Amino acid sequence: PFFPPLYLGGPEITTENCEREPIHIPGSIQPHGALLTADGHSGEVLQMSLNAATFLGQEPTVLRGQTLAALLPEQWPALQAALPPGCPDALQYRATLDWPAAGHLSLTVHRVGELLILEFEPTEAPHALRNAMFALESAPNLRALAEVATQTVRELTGFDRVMLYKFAPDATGEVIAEARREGLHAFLGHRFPASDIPAQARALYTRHLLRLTADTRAAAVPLDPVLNPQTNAPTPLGGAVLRATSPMHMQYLRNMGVGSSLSVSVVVGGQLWGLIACHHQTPYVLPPDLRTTLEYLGRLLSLQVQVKEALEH
Amino acid sequence: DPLPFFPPLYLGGPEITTENCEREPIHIPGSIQPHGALLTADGHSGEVLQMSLNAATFLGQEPTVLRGQTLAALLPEQWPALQAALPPGCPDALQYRATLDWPAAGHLSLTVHRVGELLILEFEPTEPHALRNAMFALESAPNLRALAEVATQTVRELTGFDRVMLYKFAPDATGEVIAEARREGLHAFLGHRFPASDIPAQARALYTRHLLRLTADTRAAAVPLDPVLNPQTNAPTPLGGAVLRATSPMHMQYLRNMGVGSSLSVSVVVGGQLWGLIACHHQTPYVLPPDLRTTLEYLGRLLSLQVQVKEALEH
């Protein structure tokens, strides 16, 4: 099963109980964005991140009464149609708001049962993706495909290190390709135990295909209330990219000297084949539109891995 | 019966009839569609060899001036990028794309690929979260039918085409429309089936490697290359990989007879085989700009993946 989260007086995690940390329900988010939850029917704002006032520019109480209808007039009917009752928690809808306080915000919404989860992040506003797609497809074998993928991602993102991290049948991990800035350790060829990415992390990564820690030293921002009014239970946040990273994994990243981390799942035959894993030495908020490019690349790599593995077997 | 290609018309080959379809050499027509321009150049020196006859009007230069310069001089910023992206021996399927600001012609999209020692350069005029939203909707579709319906509707919304269909090949190469989105008033093709020869075997082979082709105006005359043969080889210039390549006159007549002014299909490729086509129709001529066509190319790949996934959920 899972332990209760901390804020419901559950045990603190150790290396004795890696597998049982309820990483999906931390009750908090990373501070480079803001999150609101809301009722599926009424559009009634039920929870907000204590930092919402910053991003939205709204007097705190104003929000926690109001309706999405009021708050987002153009958007609220689109949401209603895009995310019908009963849809999967994996389905997401995005829009760009030109919002008074903040030039442009990206809005990302998904639905978990009766709750809409809304994420707001700063945003903005060429051929590198098309060029990359063809490059991946003409790679002659899996090894070269891995090399092209890591190089392409590094060029698109500027990340200090990009790896392709492949799982063995026992969930032992191996770094089979790597693109990195001069003057970093090489992790190419190294293998790591399965407990570095615990089973409950791997399952969540099979369904929700991108996560990140923008700053491995930033404090999480609580949800208020912490419990969902609807249920008097924790809000599931695993489909939210803003979700606070496990402090065990942030300790792991800090001990490695990483300041910013991001990965994309490569899913083949319904299973987690591996990860595009990125490191930055310093804090780094990759903007939403560039993340989208990596999300596309994730799908394309999933296709090409199967194609390429089929021409060996 | 499968038989080798005839020589093209310009090398004294015969004219194509219903008798001998599968032998038209549709990859070497010696000509392009008039809404863009094409140059060929030597892959090592960058000497310009062939050009479409309309090139002066896209590129704003006399032929003899174009042909008298190397790509190093014509494309000083792109020439080194081309050479890195398209190394000798690379496959003909690999494409490099850039946007140019050309004085006379505005923003041009440049698409380049390499066939042996030849570079092929295509120039076309070029111009929010719809793709991301579509990607997730496709993935959440519960079964093959719902996927097919979401895919057709999405493509129609992105493009404005009068008719978008998902055409699926059977094992005997006969095809069947299995989903479609269509303009009000058009008659339905859903559930109809069509003989294997409607798309002959040399087309289906080419459609497994080069995943997007089009006819922007089914009445437009083709524009010859000049000279027609590659001076490197005194042989035909391979245009299988060029979206500007002239469509087969047999196929344009099949389309005009249907009342179609514009056609476009994306290949859906599963396990190395052509599974089906996203096929679109418009009643009037219609040019879809290169950046919009890129969205369809990306959806072609997504759909190939999702078709595998939906079919595996099915035994």
Ligand SMILES: *C/C=C1/C(=C/c2[nH]c(/C=C3[NH+]=C(/C=C4\NC(=O)C(C=C)=C4C)C(C)=C\3CCC(=O)O)c(CCC(=O)O)c2C)NC(=O)[C@H]1C
């Ligand atoms: C008690 C359990 C421990 C634990 C937990 C844990 N680990 C993750 C997630 C990740 N761990 C990763 C590990 C590596 N990154 C590398 O670069 C290398 C090798 C050079 C390794 C072995 C990775 C890539 C992830 C994915 C996330 C990311 O991209 O940063 C989680 C889940 C984090 C979250 O989503 O909140 C958890 C709980 N890690 C341990 O080392 C043990 C002690």
Ligand SMILES: *C/C=C1/C(=C/c2[nH]c(/C=C3[NH+]=C(/C=C4\NC(=O)C(C=C)=C4C)C(C)=C\3CCC(=O)O)c(CCC(=O)O)c2C)NC(=O)[C@H]1C
């Ligand atoms: C004597 C040979 C004939 C022939 C040749 C031919 N056909 C193609 C390619 C295509 N034919 C298509 C046929 C259909 N379009 C539809 O809408 C339907 C059903 C509603 C069918 C059956 C299609 C879709 C294509 C693909 C290209 C496209 O999307 O327009 C070629 C190759 C064309 C080229 O690449 O230049 C050739 C030579 N078709 C016949 O019917 C016989 C008479």
